[PDB]
Design a protein around this ligand. Structure first.
Ligand SMILES: Nc1ncnc2c1ncn2[C@@H]1O[C@H](COP(=O)(O)OP(=O)(O)O)[C@@H](O)[C@H]1O
Ligand SMILES: N#CC(=C(/N)Sc1ccccc1N)/C(C#N)=C(\N)Sc1ccccc1N
Ligand SMILES: [Ca+2]
Ligand SMILES: [Mg+2]
Ligand code: NA
Length: 314
């Protein structure tokens, strides 16, 4: 099902054509336009590649490591030059300079779903149907073409654009980067699967759980753990916990679920199959792709771009 349609193929070709015109990426060739956001890993800027005139997203990872480590990081990232999917954020290149790695990617003018959610309050089921399709296909592509899993699915890692595209970013492609990064830390574990938090199972199944959790959060307008109360429910639809406590809850308590009545049973069943604690009982990518919720959503003519622009005010 990784077949690309006409419009998708055209967009990929255009991206590659533009990329080919870009030569070696150099620090001084960039002009900052604005700060897109930050993380405990690095900051992200909307920049302009002066020579090509191309607009890009530049992620700066401040690391005073040896000129050796950074070189291994840059090398491992080179693999993204062949990663071309309508569901994965475009890659321009990477380089080091002034004590910090730079990662240049396709700029997504709609921002991340975490940002979109803040403005929306909550995202409509039909809109989440398109998001689900994109995420599954993105995970499928990474697994198939690059034989890897995302490892960090969450709202802030799902980007969208005025073109109506939905793409994944920040997948674990460079083991060294993950290592160098996973040495320090500061990257939420709140969307990690119970098996990963227990150190038992670690596969694509883990990414499916994270997606299911992200879907619930987006549907109800709040991180769903722990579960809301009748009060919240009636408030949300009319109709604190320290990090370490949260992680234990996830591992020990029953998974979150969507409230009844407000969402179709197909959507509820879909997230339920994603949120089964036992990674073996939890649905897999092939099963999700043919799930009734996905089949229905795929056949729905949803103007995602329109809804998005109206919601964030583009
Ligand atoms: N390619 C991009 N286009 C537009 N915005 C982006 C892009 N990449 C990242 N961002 C924004 O920059 C923010 C910071 O990214 P990041 O450093 O990975 O911290 P986070 O854990 O929130 O993802 C993201 O939350 C997202 O809103
Ligand atoms: N490699 C890598 C990236 C990571 N965030 S590493 C990671 C992943 C999952 C869980 C833990 C860790 N530590 C990353 C960065 N920075 C990128 N893939 S850059 C990138 C490259 C092409 C398109 C979009 C993006 N964000
Ligand atoms: Ca410089
Ligand atoms: Mg991110
Ligand atoms: Na600089």
């Amino acid at each position: 099902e990784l077949e690309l349609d006409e419009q998708q193929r055209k967009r990929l070709e255009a991206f590659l054509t533009q990329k080919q015109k870009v030569g070696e990426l150099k620090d001084d060739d960039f002009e900052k336009i604005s700060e897109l956001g930050a993380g405990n890993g690095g900051v992200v800027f909307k920049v302009s590649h002066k020579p090509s005139g191309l607009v890009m997203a530049r992620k700066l990872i401040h690391l005073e490591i040896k000129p050796a480590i950074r070189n291994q990081i840059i090398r491992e990232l080179q693999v993204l030059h062949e990663c071309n999917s309508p569901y994965i954020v475009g890659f321009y290149g990477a380089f080091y300079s002034d004590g910090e790695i730079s990662i240049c990617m396709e700029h997504m003018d709609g921002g991340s779903l975490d940002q979109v959610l803040k403005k929306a309050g909550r995202i409509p089921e039909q809109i989440l149907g398109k998001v689900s399709i994109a995420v599954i296909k993105g995970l499928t592509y990474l697994r198939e073409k690059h034989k890897i899993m995302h490892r960090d699915v969450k709202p802030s890692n799902i980007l969208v654009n005025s073109r109506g595209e939905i793409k994944l970013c920040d997948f674990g492609v460079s083991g060294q980067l993950i290592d160098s990064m996973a040495n320090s830390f500061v990257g939420t574990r709140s969307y990690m699967s119970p098996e990963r938090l227990q150190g038992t199972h670690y596969s694509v199944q883990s990414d499916i759980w994270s997606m299911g959790l992200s879907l619930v959060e987006m549907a109800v307008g709040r991180y769903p753990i722990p579960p809301p109360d009748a009060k919240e429910l009636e408030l949300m639809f009319g109709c604190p916990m320290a990090i370490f406590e949260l992680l234990d809850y996830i591992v020990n308590e029953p998974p979150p679920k969507l409230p009844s009545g407000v969402f179709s049973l197909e959507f509820q069943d879909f997230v339920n199959k994603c949120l089964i604690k036992n990674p073996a009982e939890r649905a897999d990518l092939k099963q999700l792709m043919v799930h009734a919720f996905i089949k229905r959503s795929d056949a729905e003519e949803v103007d995602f771009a329109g809804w998005l622009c109206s919601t964030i005010g583009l």
